[PDB]
Design a protein around this ligand. Structure first.
Ligand SMILES: N[C@@H](CC(=O)O)C(=O)O
Ligand SMILES: N[C@@H](CC(=O)O)C(=O)O
Ligand code: NA
Ligand code: NA
Lengths: 298, 298
């Protein structure tokens, strides 16, 4: 009968703008609030992370769902994955077009098919089978992302992790990818062990950053490798994982980690990663390393 | 200069016939000699796994390339992945249709793009960009696989590791999937850490078996985790990884492992798994526990 925890992240970045910045803070707080409210109410770890990531999908400030970056086609292709710590259940979708909430489709892949990963037109056909509508792809496009893709041609992720009241853990990750990706490019976010991992015997991670690197070191399984070795903190394990990515590959990013026991951290190696957690009636939140707030829950 | 090594596997099942069993053994032996002849000539670990995996794709007796199993729609959809132990270079393709050699596409993903993983139509557009030609899909279909699909719709993989002369390690895995899979179903094969892993600091692995289980435990990455911990032979590291997958998930499968020092093992918890290894002047081969033969290299 354990003390619930939920942690969310809003994606490793560089400098965040002005008006944009209070609102990003506001977003993670509201998604992690919601996911925690799911847990207080007695719902599962899996329920909480889906809810949190689904709100950060619908939120246009974040690169997942609505708000997703564009491919070299000026097109939205999204990846996402969810896992259950109890029995290792998993669900994931890659290169999905015209679906407002991939994390939901992914959880449907988990509960309703004997598989863990569907891609492209097959995940589209499945969305229909599940009774999910496609939306016009223009709906997911914000004008800021057209200018990002214009620039990236001219010149030169959200997640949550939860411990529920019965002690189960789970993670969820959802992305638009990296701006100007080739068509049908798949990052780490739909990939079990890279975009996140969940196992009740250790804990749960959700990662963000340069996807190819995350893939190559199995970043999420790696934080947990370090944590399952006996005498390390979640905070240490996070940094060793992320250290190995930076130093081995020049790969920056971040993750969020919650342990079997309720411990949690949000670490990043890139310039910033908006995050928030909820535990024991307080809500924590930050973007840079030096704006951490605490505040009594609502 | 290290003594080069090369192992291949032909995937594990419930049973194999007797007319096509001598022919299965011949197949893994030939792909192994082919790949190992590349290493003897000064080709890279990566050259040799592409070459052996590509031969096995072309050998119609194996569920990869020509001879790939059928999805629910009686169609062929293929996955493959390849990895460079030296810099963690990786390349992958999922849900690939009408291409003769999915492993060679995956390698062109590694060397020719800034990405690691392409899927579906994106993989296809990348193939046309590379000069590769679609084939009609009927010619990857065997009659054996038309009848499996029906046997399953009524009632109810290949890979390689190398250590080259300069001591680089690598793997390649290619499959047609599992019979009667959902369109767009992605298995462990194109997934780094699950279908295989290669890291010069440890060794390289290629897996086969229950795809969903393989991904949930990150089976290749795990084999290698035990091995990097110390106190373990390659034999033990693979018993534990596979023993865990089976104890935690009832998932059965196999792997081929080669450590950075030249020691290799082939290991399965399925009834059988075809494999061959070449090292020095001798060729090892087998399917079941009591049928390992060691013969002078030709
Ligand atoms: N991991 C994401 C990008 C990010 O984390 O911001 C991807 O490569 O698909
Ligand atoms: N691992 C393969 C199946 C096998 O190896 O037999 C897949 O599920 O895609
Ligand atoms: Na969003
Ligand atoms: Na074949």
């Amino acid at each position: 009968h354990m003390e619930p925890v939920l942690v969310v992240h809003g994606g490793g970045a560089s400098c965040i703008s002005c008006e944009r910045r209070q609102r990003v803070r506001q977003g993670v707080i509201r998604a992690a609030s919601l996911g925690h409210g799911v847990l207080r109410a007695g719902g599962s770890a899996v329920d909480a992370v889906e809810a949190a990531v689904a709100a950060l999908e619908d939120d246009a400030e974040f690169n997942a769902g609505h708000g997703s970056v564009l491919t070299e086609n000026g097109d939205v292709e999204m990846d996402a994955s969810i896992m259950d710590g109890r029995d290792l259940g998993a669900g994931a979708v890659s290169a999905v077009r015209c679906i407002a909430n991939p994390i939901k489709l992914a959880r449907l892949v988990m509960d309703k098919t004997p598989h863990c990963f569907l891609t492209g037109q097959g995940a589209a056909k499945f969305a229909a089978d599940m009774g999910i509508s496609e939306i016009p792809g223009e709906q997911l496009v914000t004008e800021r992302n057209r200018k990002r893709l214009e620039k990236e041609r001219q010149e030169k992720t959200v997640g949550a992790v939860a411990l529920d009241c019965k002690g189960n853990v789970a993670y969820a990750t959802s992305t638009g990818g990296i701006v100007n990706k080739m068509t049908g490019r798949v990052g780490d976010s739909p990939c079990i062990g890279s975009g996140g991992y969940a196992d009740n015997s250790i804990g749960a991670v959700s990662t963000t950053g340069h996807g190819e690197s995350i893939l190559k070191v199995n970043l999420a399984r790696l934080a947990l490798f370090h944590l399952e070795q006996g005498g390390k903190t979640v905070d240490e394990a996070a940094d060793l994982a992320l250290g190995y990515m930076k130093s081995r590959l020049k790969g920056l990013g971040g993750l969020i980690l919650v342990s079997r026991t309720g411990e949690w951290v949000a670490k990043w190696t890139s310039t910033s990663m908006p995050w928030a957690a909820v535990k024991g009636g307080k809500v924590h939140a930050g973007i840079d390393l030096n704006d951490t707030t605490v505040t009594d829950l609502c």
